[model samples]
Target: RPKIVVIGGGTGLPVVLNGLRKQAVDITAVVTIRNVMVALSSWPDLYKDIFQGNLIGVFDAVQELSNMMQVDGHVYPALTLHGKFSDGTHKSLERVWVTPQAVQPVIDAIMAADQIVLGPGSLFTSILPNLTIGNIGRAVCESDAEVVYICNIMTGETDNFSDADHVRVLNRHLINTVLVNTEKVPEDYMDFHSKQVSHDFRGLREQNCRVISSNFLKLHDGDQVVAELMNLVGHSDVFR
Candidate 1:
């Protein structure tokens, strides 16, 4: 009954599923919605995320987009690709080809996961664009579940990102841990600001299975950034 699989989306997947719905487990949240078709730009850009009439592209309200007459839990924004970003050291952003009918049901929910979260957001745009979709990054490096990477704190603005470029661009995946944020951001909020908030821990722990570096973050910004990400998937080593 412990089956989780949170890929990612905006507002950091609703505060990481509001602290993982308080535990127990059985979540399969993977969202990939496109910009509100750029606020419905005067229509006709395929009628923005299409639903343009009597079954145009059928639809994409992300399939009812969570609604028990108005609530949550439901996803399906298939395709509208184009999302690129770079600062690996330079600068590049804008744009995509496609393939995302929710990614083979998120690789069959990551082959029936035991855990698989990348559930914060904007790691190279909404979590590395679904890990560059090579079969959901080869089903998360051939899953065995426990591939977390939730490191989003030090928000003194932004800038290229770091914490070890999210484990060096998903370096072929096994990254079994790394939920950083050693807490302590907001002295000068990066003084003048040129988008600079990165506390690279020298060794962001390469090709991992460890690195929980706690205090999980909470110095402001909505407060409570991580209460150990609520249970953090039944903990294996969340700062013991």
Candidate 2:
């Protein structure tokens, strides 16, 4: 089985893993340590029940439980990091770094991977947090692994972003091929819904990022996406 390293946090992780888990590939998932409970500050009691008990530490121990439960492969936390904006205005995200600066296992995994997959979530929050880490980011930049980015379906925090724009942002960190969606949502629904990201073949080529467009919204078969990924793993030239 070819070894693959998947990177992302939150809801995005499962969508990518849901298919890859069934593939005949050695998979390792790298996730961020989120501070989601910080959003629960409005409900102080529930927050207290979780964090005040210092359950984060307790929850960390459950990796053993997952192992016994026979999860497909390893899951490593990317970093225990914090972000700081460049200026007081908070308009620019300068960098993110982990404290104590311990060596992360994910870096070693990236170096060993046949492929490195990024996202499927928020580019900044779920994905970039992992990449912006000095060690992991540098490892990815230097690694020989094929970098595949699974672009998201809708525009949320990154308002008015094209499929190509998503890839552009990641290029600051890095990527080779981008999986994009070409299935169109109704134009009438535009008034009520966030716009589905438009395919930008020209833009993608302009950036020299290889594009794979599909109707990913309706993946009826088992890991059709993973099957496509495996195809990439076998071939050197996507254009061929």
Candidate 3:
């Protein structure tokens, strides 16, 4: 059986996997730890500071997941307290404040798989952080399984990736593979969706990675997003 590993963070992984589940493929999800940690840590502050209300129950749940993931220390009081202790003068928080400590299980899972799919999630907080970890990067880079990256649907303000901007950031993070996404949805529709086309696919031709486009939307008759990925990957060597 061909093994498939899907790595990403937040709700995006589950959304993609839900579609993949219908396909005839062995699949595993390697979730990003950074987002989990940050979301958990911010929960308390958001409730306590922003909402100006006490929600210990909600905080407890966040803390519980943080602990279950072994990231409570990095995500919670540690990150907040450390920032205060350092007088908020710390730079390189991305490296020192948060560790790839949450990625061990993902690395282990990938080691046991035959194919790896990265992304369809937030570019910086999800995919790039995993690549930053030496072990995860090496595993994906050296794995015998083919690697595929499902590029994001829209650029994020936090991540600053747009259209081909997604590929550029992935290259900076050392991800090498073919990228898949929908054909240009019309500028008006893209704007309605709050997405801007930053990099033209035509302009990205010189790179080592191939950008695969499809009338995936047109052929699907409507469910154009991830359903297109299923069709494209099914025909490609990466998934086979």
Clashes (N, CA, C under 3 Å) per candidate:
1, 0, 0
Q: Lowest-lDDT window of 10 residues in candidate 2?
A: 33-42
* Cα-based TM-score, every candidate: 0.28, 0.75, 0.57
Clashing pairs for predicted structure model 3, backbone only: none
Query: What are the lDDT figures for the candidates, one per model?
Result: 0.53, 0.65, 0.51
- Order the numbered candidates by TM-score, best leading: 2, 3, 1
RMSD to truth, every model? 18.0, 7.6, 9.6
Between candidates 1 and 3, the one scoring higher on lDDT is 1
Candidate 2 lDDT over 1-240, as tens digits, reads: 577888765655565576676567767777652222221122344543554443334236435534533555666663464655555413444444454342466788888788888876777777877677667787777877888877787772466778888888777544788888777666666665456776888888898788887766652122556766778776744222
Model 1: lDDT to the true structure = 0.53
| Residue 238 lDDT (model 2) | 23
Clashes of 1: 1
Candidate 2: where are CA atoms >4 Å away? Answer: 33-62, 78-103, 187-193, 219-222, 237-240
